[PDB]
Amino acid sequence: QCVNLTTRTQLPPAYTNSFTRGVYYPDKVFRSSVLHSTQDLFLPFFSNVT
Amino acid sequence: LSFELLHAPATVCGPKKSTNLVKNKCVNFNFNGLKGTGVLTESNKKFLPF
Ligand SMILES: *[C@@H]1O[C@H](CO)[C@@H](O)[C@H](O)[C@H]1NC(C)=O
Numbered sequence: 514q515c516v517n518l519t520t521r522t523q524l525p526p527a528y529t530n531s532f533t534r535g536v537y538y539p540d541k542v543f544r545s546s547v548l549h550s551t552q553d554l555f556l557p558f559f560s561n562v563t
Numbered sequence: 564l565s566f567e568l569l570h571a572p573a574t575v576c577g578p579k580k581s582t583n584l585v586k587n588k589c590v591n592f593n594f595n596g597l598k599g600t601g602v603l604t605e606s607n608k609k610f611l612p613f
Contacts (some may be wrong), residue, residue, distance in 0.1 A: 545612050 531562045 535556025591601045 538613075541613050543608060545608075 526563050529562055530557075531556055531560045533558060535560075 520545050539551050571597075584603075586603055586605075589600070590601065591600050
C-alpha cells in the first residue's frame with residue numbers, strides 16, 4: 514500500500530558555499546607534472562549550494 | 564540459438580584472436596582496439612586502477 518500524506522512542512526533550506534570542491538578525473542590517461550586545460554561540466558568555484 | 568542485434572551497445576562479441584607478447588622489437592601492436600607501431604619495454608610508471 515501507498516499511504517497518502519498531505520501534512521508536509523515547508524522548511525526553508527540553508528544556502529552555503531562550495532569553495533574548492535567539485536573536481537574529478539575527466540578521463541583514464543596518465544600524466545606526470547603537467548598543466549592541462551580541459552573543457553567539461555564542472556562545479557564553479559565559490560558557488561551557491563543548497 | 565537466435566541472435567538479436569538492435570540499437571544497443573552489444574556487449575556480447577565472443578570469439579577473438581589471442582597472441583603472445585614480444586619485447587625489445589619494433590613491432591605492430593593493438594591494445595583493446597588501440598593501434599600503433601613501435602618497440603615496447605618494461606615500464607616503471609605507477610598508474611591508477613582506472
Ligand atoms: C545564494 O542565493 C541566494 C538567493 O537565492 C542569495 O540570497 C545568497 O546571498 C547567495 N549566496 C551567495 C551569493 O553566496
